[PDB]
Structure formats: C-alpha cells, structure tokens
Amino acid sequence: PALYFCGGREDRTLYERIVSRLRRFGTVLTEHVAAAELGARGEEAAGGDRLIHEQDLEWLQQADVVVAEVTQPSLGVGYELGRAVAFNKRILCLFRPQSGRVLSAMIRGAADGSRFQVWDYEEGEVEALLDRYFEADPL
C-alpha cells in the first residue's frame, strides 16, 4: 500500500512519530527537505516549485490513503487536502486541540466522517490512533 503524508519541537516530533507509524502500513510518500529553501527564494524558484507541485500531485493520485497533520495553519497542507478531495481520496486529518490552535471550519466542514475524517488527538496517543484507524479499515 502507498500512504501520502502532509504536515515547533512538539509539531516536528509528532510529524516524525506519525510518519514512523505509517511506515508500518505501507510505503510512505512524504518530502519536505527543499520546501523551506525553495520558499525562501520566492518567484525566482517558481520553476523548482512547479516540479515539486507536480511530484506531490502524482503521489496524491498514487496514494491509497492521504494523512494530514492539520494543527499548524498551512496553505500547502490545505491545498493538498483540496486536491485530495477532488481526487476522491480516503483522507485522515489529525488535529491537536491542546496546541491552542483553532482548526479551520472549512477543514472540519469538508469531512463527511467516513471517507474524510478529522480526528482530534492528544500527542501521547497518535500511534494507538493510527493502529485503530488501519485495523478498522485496512489498506
């Protein structure tokens, strides 16, 4: 199975823990290594940005499931979720209310509670939640 992942210290350690657990269920498609540097270059890196955008789109279409950590506001994560919905992907969004953030009503409103789910979680149970998600509906 193929899994697409998109997403301070708490956020980054949870991204690492989610990706590590997703690797138990199939091949994880995720990449963020150049995003900060491409972004810092602005309009001058538009060419490289178009390449990474095409790559993320091909991975979203290949994916059997899209998983997003939606705690921190992000235009990139929101965009990839919009494209994933139009591709009718199975999607799981994970949001941590204890971060102080308010999750966008648009993201909570896009979830139907079946094909697209949004789950609130506490940092300590994210592995157990992913095991629950994939046992109740295996890939």
What is the pairing mode between strands 91-95 and 27-29?
unpaired
Q: Is 76 annotated as a binding residue?
A: yes
> Interacting stretch for ligand A1I0K, rule CB under 6 A, among 13-21, 69-77, 85-93, 116-124?
69-77
Pairing label, strands 116-120, 2-6: unpaired
In the complex, residue closest to ligand A1I0K by CB: 76
Q: Cα Rg for the chain, rounded, in angstroms?
A: 15
Stretch binding a copy of itself (CB under 8 A), from 12-20, 36-44, 121-129, 131-139: 36-44
Does residue 56 belong to the site contacting ligand A1I0K (CB under 6 A)?
Answer: yes
Contact flag: residue 74 with ligand A1I0K (CB under 6 A): yes
